[PDB]
Amino acid sequence: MVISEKVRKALNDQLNREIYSSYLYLSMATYFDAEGFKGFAHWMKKQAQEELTHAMKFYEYIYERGGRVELEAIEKPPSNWNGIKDAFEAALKHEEFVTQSIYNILELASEEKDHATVSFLKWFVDEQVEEEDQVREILDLLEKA
């Protein structure tokens, strides 16, 4: 393995966080569909699939560095929200937690002088920041102020 175990575990943790992200967006879709919001459910379904490509990017990086992936149990997500804005605000809050979690790994890899992982994570935060901004675009679009 050409990464430290500490970094491997953090990346594996993050991969599992991307999986939970995908499941949370699917659960938001079950809520939107239960309320009849077909189009917003479809947005959530495509976002759930986008989250799986995030998990597979971490998957591929870990094996490239000689690590292995270990899948953990997935927590039951919430199944109800109080309207569209309420669901998308919960997603914004979740993606901000995800963005900070990735910045934490990048700090760790930087302290270890793990240049390859620093490069990987620097590239990925740019995609995470735009996925967060996609959530903000919806909230701004519905801002019925």
Interface residues toward Fe ion, by CB under 5 A: 18, 21, 51, 54
CA distance 68 to 77: 26
Q: Is 13 in the site for a copy of itself (CB under 8 A)?
A: no
Task: Decide: residue 73, CB within 10 A, 0-12 exposed, 13-18 middle, 19+ buried.
Answer: exposed
Question: What SS3 state is found at 96?
Answer: helix
Single out the residue of 1, 46, 53, 70 in contact with a copy of itself (rule: CB under 8 A).
Answer: 70
Is the CA virtual torsion 6, 102, 95, 19 positive or negative?
Answer: negative
Single out the residue of 40, 43, 58, 59 in contact with a copy of itself (rule: CB under 8 A).
Answer: 59
Task: Give the residue at shortest CB distance from Mg ion.
Answer: 134
Q: Is 123 in the site for a copy of itself (CB under 8 A)?
A: no
Binding range to Mg ion, per CB under 5 A, among 4-12, 26-34, 60-68, 79-87: 79-87
